[PDB]
Structures are given as structure tokens and as C-alpha cells.
Design a protein around this ligand. Sequence first.
Ligand code: EST
Lengths: 211, 214
Amino acid sequence: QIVMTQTPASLSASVGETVTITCRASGNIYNYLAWYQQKQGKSPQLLVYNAKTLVDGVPLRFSGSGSGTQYSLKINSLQPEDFGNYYCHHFWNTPYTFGGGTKLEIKRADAAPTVSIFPPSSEQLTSGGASVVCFLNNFYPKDINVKWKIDGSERQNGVLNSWTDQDSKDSTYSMSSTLTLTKDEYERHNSYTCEATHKTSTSPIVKSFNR
Amino acid sequence: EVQLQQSGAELVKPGASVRLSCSASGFNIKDTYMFWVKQRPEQGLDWIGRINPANGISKYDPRFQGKATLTADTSSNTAYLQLDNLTSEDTAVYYCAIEKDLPWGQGTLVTVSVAKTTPPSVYPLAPGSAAQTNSMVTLGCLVKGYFPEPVTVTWNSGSLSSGVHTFPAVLQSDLYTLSSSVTVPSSTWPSETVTCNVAHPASSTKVDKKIVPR
Ligand SMILES: C[C@]12CC[C@@H]3c4ccc(O)cc4CC[C@H]3[C@@H]1CC[C@@H]2O
């Protein structure tokens, strides 16, 4: 069976940058390949099939190439909306194996996390639990760590962190840090704190509430 | 219009079988080669098989041979995919597609699990009293303790589009937690009204929790 090995596994480049994603087939696929772009949560989008042929509506910046076993996709003049995963589809014969996929981040000038802290919801309290949430919106690079100072000492017990994908325009991220405590634990402490240490300010971004 | 619609998402206990129905509209499958794709949470695209509806001869990837069955009837153009003896390694998004320039199906999520369906408790996230007057504010909705995926969080019934951020829920003891924020000018808040609306189909539950100051 013709196995597809695609590379690079992960990638990053800035707006306006010409890039080249490659898929190399174990056996000669005689130009029977297709490239797909899968933006998060959405369905694969056919960009190029029959090696070089581009689908209607696909922006002229996306170029397809290859021959024999080596096939390459070249996105000239990268644009913010070009982020996501890219796969290659082989269909010279069965099975029509897919590639490993290439991750694509978009290089942008660093931005700092607009931190916000919200104490537990007025209602939630009665259930017996209390999630103190801190939203750190619109920053970059994804590289960033937040820490939960409970009152004086540090906390890291029971925290959920989630990052969104790159924004369609500002290529920035966002993180939802949630320290989930229990009614009593929350009732026995005051100055809860969300300290965000990001690669943009030696002095950490700090937002907190006292209760 | 020429497009495919796949079945609704389904929650199945391990061991059972599922028959997914991909309905094509605007054309006839008897003249198209159909095939399906698998995609595990956060993982890659797996080719499951291929089929020619006219005669019914389907080719499969050995990996799925023992559980996947592509079947297609021309009478209604509805292509099917039967998945036998479902295990957790099957919980994934299955897509329907045709071997032409026509966009795939929206995908049908098959969540193989034992967890009973549970409705999300949505909690409004309003600031704990901080000088909010500063150009724009940021409020949120924290939906937690629900299963299974997916759910729908929107602000002011689609009115609020810009500045909304929904985070990919995270599993925990078989329950999920997801959240969304919104950055509205200091003006609309709280002179205007802003509330998130979260819908959870699997439990037929929809909910509106008003974002009001504390
Ligand atoms: C559906 C695929 C992309 C679209 C290709 C196409 C696209 C247009 C067309 O007129 C014919 C074909 C034949 C093979 C198809 C491919 C089979 C594998 C791949 O997924």
C-alpha cells in the first residue's frame, strides 16, 4: 500500500511569507494526490487535486506541485486566514491513505494578555463549588504561564486551562484558566489571584479580587 | 443545491453498532464514487473506504474491514456507514464525501461511551466589582458539568459576534466544562442587556442566564 509521509509536522511563518508543505509517497502515485486545508472544527477543504489542479474559488496564492513520490504545496504570500492543518490525499490506488498533517501557526508581533478575573457566580455558590475564572484574551506567542495565588501561598490544585485557535485577523490566542474550588474552600480565603507571566513584560500581569 | 447532509450526532455504549446516513441532495449517487473519513479527537484523517452505489462494490482499509461497512441505496441517494462493535477508539468525527469537487458532509460525531447524557449548568461571569469603566469590559459564561459534546454558546442570540471567545471544553470525570467571554464597550454595559444563550441538543435543553452585576 502507498504510505504517505508529510512534513513538516508543525510550522510557523509570518504574513506575506511564501511557504512549502511537502508530502512524500512511499510508492509512485503518478500525480494522484490532493491537498486539504482543515481549519479547526470545520470540514476539510479541497485545495488541489490531480497534483497541480486548484479548485474553483481557491485563491491564486495556493500553488500545488510535485512528481513521482515527492509532492509540494506552496502558499505564496501567506495570509492570516491560511492558518490550520494541511493534509495530502493519495488516490493512485486503495487504500486512499492520508498524510500526517501539517500544523500552521501565523507569526505575528507579540501582544500581551488582557487579563480579567471573575469570582465565582452568585448562583453556583449554593451547589457547593466555586470556580474562579480568569480570562487572558488576545496575546501572543501562545507561550505563557499563569499562576494562582490563593491568598498568600501558591495554588495549582484543580485548574483547567484552554486555548482558542489563532484569530482570523489578529492571529492572537486566548486562555481560560479556571481554578475550581469547593464552597467552603472559597469561603475561607480572600485575595484570590491570577498572575500572568508572559514573554512581553518582566513585570507579570496581575489581576485579582479580594472578596 | 448540490450538497450532502449527514445524520445527527449519536451517543453509543461500547459494543453496539451505528448506521450513519449521509443524504446527498441536488444530484444522484448512482453516478458518483462515495467514501468516508475518520478523525479522532485532535487527531488525523483516516480513509475508511470507498463505494460505488450503482453496483455496491466497496473497498476498505484493512484496519476498518472488521467494523466498517459502506452501503448505498439509489432509491433515496442516502449513503450509509455501519459501525460494528464500537469501542472508545472509535469515538470520532466521521465525514461523508464524493470523489469530485463537492464539499464533504458536516461530519457526524459518534461519541462511544457509557456516560449518561447530562445538561450543562450555565453560570454568568460578571466582574467582582472593579473599575469597569475603561473603554470596554469583558464578561463571560462558564458552562460546566455536561455531557456529551457538542453545545452552542452565543451572545444575545447572534447579535454579539465580535469579541466573543469560546474555549474547547475539557473532559473531567466524564463531564465537560466550556466557557465564553465577550468584550463590550463600557457603554453597553450595563445600560444595555447582554446574556449568553447555550443550547445542548442531546438533552433538549436550552438556557438563558442573564449577565447582571453582583
Ligand atoms: C475525492 C478526491 C478529491 C477529488 C478528486 C476529483 C475531483 C474532481 C473530479 O472531476 C474528479 C475527481 C476524481 C478523484 C477525486 C479524489 C479521490 C480522493 C480525494 O479525496
